[PDB]
């Protein structure tokens with residue numbers, strides 16, 4: 217199993233939408249269970265502290281095991297800016313595929329900065 221976010225960007229302003237282009241493949245012998253995108257606040261040990269707006273752009277049965285999709289992912293306008301997080305904490309855009317009913321996973325989790333471009 218594999219998954220890539222093909223059009224990465226480093227930052228986003230809360231309230232904006234990221235137009236994700238995502239390639240995934242469940243892998244030979246596997247069946248896609250879902251593809252999920254969720255914004256996470258992490259600590260310095262890469263342990264999740266908060267999860268925001270969990271989405272499942274691929275889900276259900278009869279989905280293609282491998283495809284490239286476009287998916288608009290929104291950051292709520294009131295999620296705290298990166299500069300206002302506790303020391304060492306950061307945002308990670310979790311982008312991942314589950315195969316075989318959560319039997320195995322792969323990810324293209326990508327660090328992102330939430331900032332206010334007016335400031």
Ligand SMILES: [Ca+2]
Nearest residue numbers: 323324325326
């Ligand atoms: Ca990666």
